[PDB]
Amino acid sequence: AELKMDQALLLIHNELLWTNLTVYWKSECCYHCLFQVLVNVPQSPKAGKPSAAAASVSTQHGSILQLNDTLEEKEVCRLEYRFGEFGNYSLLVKNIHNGVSEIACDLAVNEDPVDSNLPVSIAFLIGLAVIIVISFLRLLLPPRLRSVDTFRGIALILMVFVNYGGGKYWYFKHASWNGLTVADLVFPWFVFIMGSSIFLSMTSILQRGCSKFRLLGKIAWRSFLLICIGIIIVNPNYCLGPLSWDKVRIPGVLQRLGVTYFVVAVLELLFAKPVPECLSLRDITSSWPQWLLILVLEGLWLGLTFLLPVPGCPTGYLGPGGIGDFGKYPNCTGGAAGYIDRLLLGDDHLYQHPSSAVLYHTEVAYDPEGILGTINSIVMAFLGVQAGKILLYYKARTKDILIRFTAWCCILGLISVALTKVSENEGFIPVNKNLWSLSYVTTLSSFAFFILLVLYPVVDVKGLWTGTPFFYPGMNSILVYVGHEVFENYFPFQWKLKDNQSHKEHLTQNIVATALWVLIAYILYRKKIFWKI
Amino acid sequence: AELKMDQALLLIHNELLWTNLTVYWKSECCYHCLFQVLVNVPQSPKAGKPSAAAASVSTQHGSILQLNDTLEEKEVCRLEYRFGEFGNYSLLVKNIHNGVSEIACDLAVNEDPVDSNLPVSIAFLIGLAVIIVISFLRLLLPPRLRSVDTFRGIALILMVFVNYGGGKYWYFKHASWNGLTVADLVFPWFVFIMGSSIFLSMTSILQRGCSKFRLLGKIAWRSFLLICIGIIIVNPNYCLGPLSWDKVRIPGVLQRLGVTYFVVAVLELLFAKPVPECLSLRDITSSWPQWLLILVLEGLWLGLTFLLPVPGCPTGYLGPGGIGDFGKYPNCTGGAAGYIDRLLLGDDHLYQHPSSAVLYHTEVAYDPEGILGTINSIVMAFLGVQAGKILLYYKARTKDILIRFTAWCCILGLISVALTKVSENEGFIPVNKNLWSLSYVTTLSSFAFFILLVLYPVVDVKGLWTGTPFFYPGMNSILVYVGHEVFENYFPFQWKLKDNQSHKEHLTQNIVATALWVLIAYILYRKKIFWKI
């Protein structure tokens, strides 16, 4: 069954004789949202025979219930509660006769819920036990940077886990509009790593004497391939039917990577300078044309986001539309970003399932990989380029690399704190993956600099760790990505489940599929099969 | 719409006043079948106002119509006609008053049909024009046998064309029960070529000093991979949902190839002898244990096919069931072959769409790649092994190879003539791809020996032709096969058509997809990417 996943059963008994109750529901996660009708509860026909109604409430977040007298449109009582999954609760609405004529509604638990996050806890404990067992058991018995491969492999393992379902948990899934979950981390990290690799490969190629025009042809060919593979292979759902142009989605992940790669790689190619050999700022000073153009692009993004007038919609709007912001702007999902996407591409060539559609009930199409957020993708990739420049300019001195990584992490973290005001929905620019906002970029690039600060000495300098098992996927990232897209529905990545409303079975299936992709990458590494676009 | 593909419109006007007509229809292709009701036509309410009914008739083959008085169950008139696609015909049933009281029904053509095969004729003319233009334009300006690669590439091009739809023509599609179409040629040819390659590779490996146990491990590994790829990747339709065991089809194409390869390769490994150096019979005499075991297997197939009793079903039954054979054995599709498949695997693990379901209206599941026809697959592969033995034993002398190929083609053709009596449905053993009958094997192996007889001197000895563009697919057969299975629904192999009832649009789409697969194979050949199981 009667209940789906992440749902409880609520039974309302109305003991009032002369009032018709309507119960509205609102999630605590939904910001400035409208109350939606949950169930209508009729009046009690007789004393001692309360009228009963049943409803399913979502248990992912806290709930707010408002019981309003239908005839008078007046509030009877209000209730805030976090219901548990598969719980059985009853809400009794009676008038207290102890010298008053008020109404007191109180909530009781008929049947206790289940612990929804127990499979996650057990999976983490099992994984930690495996790590400890392997470590102790084995204890009793230019080249490629291994830390960048380890970082890319970590991002790939997370991407495969969350794309395949993430156990159907809300925190292994994209945030509705604002904030961060685990699913929102990996795409900016791919952009950052791609920028780092741009600098590393380009510097290696140019020091060996290759011409700039041959390298330009290489860049153009790779960008074209990325965009075409994204449009033709990854975006369409061919289980629904043959491709028709009028419903072809033009933007996407590999399209974003292709355009960002082209712009950043050509920008580095134009002003490429040789790497020379404690207090120096030459990695920043020697590339001031790049920085000037990046700040001009960021100024353009801020200007179009906060000052471009959108017809019939507020200027500077950063919300989701739908029922959000008290339903005043239902069709305004995205603000100027969505407006530009709909104006230049049309609604039929955009993403038809924005992540805001489930919490804010948005009805317009919005594409997270739209046109306006490509500016911030370019900013993220250029920050990755700076990470690569630190790695090569101060390659001899580990102390300089660590200080530079620490300083960049601190500066970007302070900018994120200033922009977000350390809050999900407040702040001048909240963190938003759909908009690819500025604070999203600064936050995730601060995380990336911290990750490099930890991985570089451990994996590359000291040698305490080889990166297993992450550098195996990290060296076949395009094969793993295109592969898990193509073979998403195939066995053994996906089989028929006994219970589709079970977190345990979904989690087990997704963990097994992720481990299988890591094993495939390991086999490809052993046989020295590597593909690069 | 009003009409589908390969359908005409028939209008029946009943001028009789006291008779109710029922019209039954029967195809000429359907052998010993029951008449099925086409349309019921009521009596004429008044003189001069004939009652009218409309029906769609199939235009692929000739039609037989029987108009029976419904009350008396007596035949009024019978009519044989080949209707044309999208034609508009009217059938008038009136009683002739010229001194008689009989009924004369005559058929008129209101609107002429279309030429359904015109796209095929135009495609052939365009292809021939391209060949002539290229030939004249270019005229004005151990190793691998190229003829075997050309043969495999021809089979692959035909397989991709007919699997992708074949233009939706009935002759580019599998025969219902008996006979041959173009779609029925390529699978036996793959088995034949695989046997030839077994002998060639095994002889090459054993002359270089490799041990027999390492080669046995190679054979077992390759067979296991073929069977697993068939079951897990090729057989399931993952557009319908995640894999469930109770509806997993166990047999299939690569499963047949894996089992046949294992048996034939191990049989050659056991009795492998070195190749020695006009009237000799040593290619046949030196492998008499293989021939003895092959004849024992063929005796087993004949015995189980003609003498195994099947419960509630005739012994030796070779028909399709359904409405065939006058509907006396509706559930007997396959005879003993289908009985063994259903007994050992169960109906749920068999093919659910046998080719007989459309013409004979069979309702049971029958699997063309079943257990009993593996014997005849093994016979086909062993005939391919004989072709390889001829190629290597008499490699020095082209004249000996040509005489041996001619003799084998003639013997197998004479056996096919004796078995089939040169007829689709008569003969002791008719040609049947579903049953993998003996005459099917002898006929297709005779064709294969003739193909080799033509290709070997032209491509390998004289050098008049390099095999373009067939040897490019012929060197990546497993990639092309698994690839066209995985990417069948993807663009550019498949797009949305303006008219799904058009032979021209389906044919154009399928030709384009086949050419794209040939181009992919050419690109893989240029970059020296070859995959072998």
Ligand SMILES: CC(C)(COP(=O)(O)OP(=O)(O)OC[C@H]1O[C@@H](n2cnc3c(N)ncnc32)[C@H](O)[C@@H]1OP(=O)(O)O)[C@@H](O)C(=O)NCCC(=O)NCCS
């Ligand atoms: C597209 C994608 C392959 C980008 O690749 P990348 O980060 O540029 O890494 P590549 O393997 O392409 O590296 C290209 C170059 O960088 C160099 N490089 C890569 N890793 C390196 C390392 N650790 N050390 C030194 N050099 C390195 C390579 O040598 C190569 O140079 P070459 O052209 O001279 O051979 C990868 O990000 C991807 O798969 N995208 C998925 C996006 C995604 O999943 N987003 C999440 C939502 S689904």
Ligand SMILES: CC(C)(COP(=O)(O)OP(=O)(O)OC[C@H]1O[C@@H](n2cnc3c(N)ncnc32)[C@H](O)[C@@H]1OP(=O)(O)O)[C@@H](O)C(=O)NCCC(=O)NCCS
């Ligand atoms: C499965 C399949 C790849 C069989 O392969 P095959 O015909 O045995 O050819 P392979 O490429 O596997 O050749 C294997 C060996 O034969 C040798 N060989 C192949 N072609 C050769 C030639 N022309 N000359 C000499 N040797 C050859 C190879 O060198 C190889 O030897 P090695 O293992 O020592 O390297 C192929 O039949 C197939 O794709 N099956 C599809 C079935 C089908 O589509 N049926 C129709 C219904 S869809």
Ligand SMILES: *[C@@H]1O[C@H](CO)[C@@H](O[C@@H]2O[C@H](CO)[C@@H](O)[C@H](O)[C@H]2NC(C)=O)[C@H](O)[C@H]1NC(C)=O
């Ligand atoms: C439930 O009833 C309350 C009344 O107590 C409603 O609150 C009022 O809503 C109107 C909008 O129609 C506002 O103009 C008033 O300012 C609100 N008053 C207060 C005290 O909040 C509430 O809107 C009703 N719930 C729903 C879902 O309509």
Ligand SMILES: *[C@@H]1O[C@H](CO)[C@@H](O[C@@H]2O[C@H](CO)[C@@H](O)[C@H](O)[C@H]2NC(C)=O)[C@H](O)[C@H]1NC(C)=O
């Ligand atoms: C939720 O809990 C209530 C308990 O209040 C269940 O209602 C009981 O159901 C049993 C079996 O049908 C009856 O014997 C009791 O008389 C019921 N009690 C009341 C107070 O109604 C209800 O069935 C539970 N719901 C689910 C889905 O389990």
Ligand SMILES: *[C@@H]1O[C@H](CO)[C@@H](O[C@@H]2O[C@H](CO)[C@@H](O)[C@H](O)[C@H]2NC(C)=O)[C@H](O)[C@H]1NC(C)=O
């Ligand atoms: C149409 O009517 C004819 C009668 O002329 C049927 O033919 C007879 O069918 C019965 C079966 O019920 C046989 O026993 C007779 O031997 C048949 N007689 C002849 C002369 O053929 C015919 O079956 C009817 N058509 C259909 C579809 O039932």
Ligand SMILES: *[C@@H]1O[C@H](CO)[C@@H](O[C@@H]2O[C@H](CO)[C@@H](O)[C@H](O)[C@H]2NC(C)=O)[C@H](O)[C@H]1NC(C)=O
């Ligand atoms: C098939 O042909 C008949 C001609 O006999 C068409 O019937 C004619 O339809 C037109 C337009 O509706 C009428 O003006 C004529 O009076 C009809 N003639 C008769 C004799 O009925 C019929 O429409 C055609 N069917 C199709 C699908 O094209």
Ligand SMILES: CC(C)CCC[C@@H](C)[C@H]1CC[C@H]2[C@@H]3CC=C4C[C@@H](O)CC[C@]4(C)[C@H]3CC[C@]12C
């Ligand atoms: C020079 C570029 C690359 C970077 C800076 C671009 C900025 C300054 C541009 C881009 C979009 C522009 C805005 C677009 C539209 C309007 C609405 C109009 O009623 C007043 C001007 C105003 C508000 C513009 C002000 C300037 C603006 C914000």
Ligand SMILES: CC(C)CCC[C@@H](C)[C@H]1CC[C@H]2[C@@H]3CC=C4C[C@@H](O)CC[C@]4(C)[C@H]3CC[C@]12C
């Ligand atoms: C060789 C001897 C000294 C054993 C070395 C212990 C290894 C296995 C331990 C010690 C320090 C550990 C690292 C410390 C911090 C991080 C955190 C995170 O970013 C990924 C894991 C990573 C990178 C750890 C991986 C495992 C690790 C490298």
Ligand SMILES: CC(C)CCC[C@@H](C)[C@H]1CC[C@H]2[C@@H]3CC=C4C[C@@H](O)CC[C@]4(C)[C@H]3CC[C@]12C
């Ligand atoms: C020795 C093997 C490998 C090859 C030859 C097998 C032949 C001779 C076998 C296989 C199947 C057998 C048949 C299976 C079942 C029956 C039904 C029974 O009422 C009479 C015997 C009869 C008709 C058998 C006769 C012999 C038979 C035809």
Ligand SMILES: CC(C)CCC[C@@H](C)[C@H]1CC[C@H]2[C@@H]3CC=C4C[C@@H](O)CC[C@]4(C)[C@H]3CC[C@]12C
């Ligand atoms: C080099 C000069 C002499 C030109 C040679 C002409 C070539 C292109 C011609 C001449 C004979 C032709 C072959 C003769 C017979 C067959 C029939 C069929 O099984 C496939 C095509 C094939 C194999 C032909 C392909 C094209 C062919 C090889």
Ligand SMILES: CCCCCCCCCCCCCCCC
């Ligand atoms: C969050 C998802 C967790 C998935 C776990 C993946 C890691 C397990 C890898 C198993 C394959 C090991 C191959 C390398 C052997 C050296």
Ligand SMILES: CCCCCCCCCCCCCCCC
């Ligand atoms: C019966 C289907 C016919 C399909 C035609 C396929 C042959 C055309 C091949 C085109 C690709 C040429 C690549 C080789 C160039 C040397």
Ligand SMILES: *[C@@H]1O[C@H](CO)[C@@H](O)[C@H](O)[C@H]1NC(C)=O
């Ligand atoms: C409650 O709703 C029912 C449904 O029609 C209505 O008949 C009844 O009058 C309502 N009661 C009050 C007090 O409004």
Ligand SMILES: *[C@@H]1O[C@H](CO)[C@@H](O)[C@H](O)[C@H]1NC(C)=O
């Ligand atoms: C023809 O069929 C109709 C349909 O019920 C029936 O009423 C009529 O009596 C039949 N005519 C004859 C002659 O049987």
Ligand SMILES: CCCCCCCCCCCCCC
């Ligand atoms: C949903 C709340 C968003 C919080 C954004 C991140 C705040 C912290 C800034 C980064 C600190 C740097 C630590 C590596």
Ligand SMILES: CCCCCCCCCCCCCC
């Ligand atoms: C090889 C000598 C130097 C030539 C300059 C190369 C410039 C390459 C980037 C400029 C092209 C930009 C295309 C949009």
